[PDB]
Amino acid sequence: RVRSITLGNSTITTQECANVVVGYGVWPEYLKTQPDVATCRFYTLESVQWMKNSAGWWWKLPDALSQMGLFGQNMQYHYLGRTGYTIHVQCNASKFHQGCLLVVCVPEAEMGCSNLNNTPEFAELSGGDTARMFTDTQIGETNSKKVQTAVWNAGMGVGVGNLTIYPHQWINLRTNNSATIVMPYINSVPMDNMFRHNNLTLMIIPFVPLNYSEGSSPYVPITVTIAPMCAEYNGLRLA
């Protein structure tokens, strides 16, 4: 069965019996100053092409929606804000395609730099709506301000197989093709500046590479849909 979900002036369709992973057992809620409900619309980013040699993709959350409608408008307008997210990841593949994906949302995914003495620049840390790709090779140290994008360390100097500690969902093409992660607001402060701090990082890493026989489509599109939940910002009026 297919379930159609409409949010604002946007609507998407999902398999009725799809499993949703709630981040830490906590749904997005309001801070127990000024909320916005016109932002509650699905934002379908550009689809990426999963290939045989694909190493992975990642998107920093606040930044990914920085050039999308009122949410971006609110980001430049207000100085402070806080919000949760609902992330939909969908793959369009046939039964003749095989592969396994890890879809994980990492809070405060601070990333290292190829040069041990420096830190990565903003461009390399985030591409906004554009996706950032991991690399199956090791970035050389000569490079001065790029992210060490070796997949098996996930750019954080940890075991990539241990990323399952963070809210995640597996996409096994033979079994399922969609993932839904509900991420609450997680921070050490009640509100924060959205332009200088990326609270969340969504990662999609192929643990089992995509495989197919000659004649089948040589790619599998992956579509990311993000819907901000319970967004609210600081007031701008007097007392």
């Binding site: 920093k60 360390n153 100097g157 241990n162 402060v189």
Partner: protein, 214 residues
């Protein structure tokens, strides 16, 4: 049961985090340490299993002295008294043994004389934020989060120099108390390279055997 695997029993252990020396005839004979949890790799890794932490600080100081060479016919130095000053974040900081900062009333200080039980002071959670952050994906410089400032410690001889120099060494013992942790994270796998950042050099996922089958 698993009482020993709780957060409190996992992190509430004293550890020597810093070690320094200072003599009493140099004008610069004072030891300083900015309080940070990244000094010791073992403690850093244990704290970096989580993203946000909230704890109190218990500090114990082990101070010992040693007689330095002199030419005095006879040396009969009295018992030595040491001053340990805690400078809260934003407080004045000394640059010499004789400096006003040593007398700031808002900089709590402990005066301790040798031969007694080692001095001990406790600092509470002093962040304007609601928790300390071991990881920060943003800019203030990438991933600094100045909301983690915990203050600085300073140490100096109180006694004036006698007929011979005295060199003292201080061992700072660090113990988180009433710890609360949030958002588990994967254990650090690559070796730590810098104390200030998370930079790493790519390494293998695990140790290797000959073949997949025994």
């Amino acid at each position: 049961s698993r009482s020993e695997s709780s957060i409190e029993n996992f992190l509430c252990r004293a550890a020597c985090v810093y070690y320094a020396t200072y003599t009493n005839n140099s004008e610069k004979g004072y030891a300083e340490w900015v309080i940070n949890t990244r000094q010791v790799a073992q403690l850093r890794r244990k704290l970096e299993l989580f993203t946000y932490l909230r704890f109190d600080l218990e500090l114990t100081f082990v101070i010992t002295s040693a007689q330095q060479p002199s030419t005095a016919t006879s040396v009969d130095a009295p018992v030595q008294t040491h001053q340990i000053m805690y400078v809260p974040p934003g407080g004045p900081v000394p640059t010499k043994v004789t400096d006003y900062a040593w007398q700031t009333s808002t900089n709590p200080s402990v005066f301790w004389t040798e031969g007694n039980a080692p001095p001990r002071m406790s600092i509470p959670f002093i962040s304007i934020g609601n928790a300390y952050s071991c990881f920060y994906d943003g800019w203030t410089v990438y991933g600094i989060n100045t909301l983690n400032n915990m203050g600085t410690l300073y140490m100096r001889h109180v006694n004036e120099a006698g007929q011979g120099p005295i060199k003292s060494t201080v061992r700072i013992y660090f113990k988180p108390k009433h710890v609360k942790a949030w958002v588990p994270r994967p254990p650090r796998l690559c070796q730590y390279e810098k104390q200030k950042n998370v930079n790493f050099t790519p390494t293998g996922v695990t140790t290797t055997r000959v073949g997949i089958t025994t």
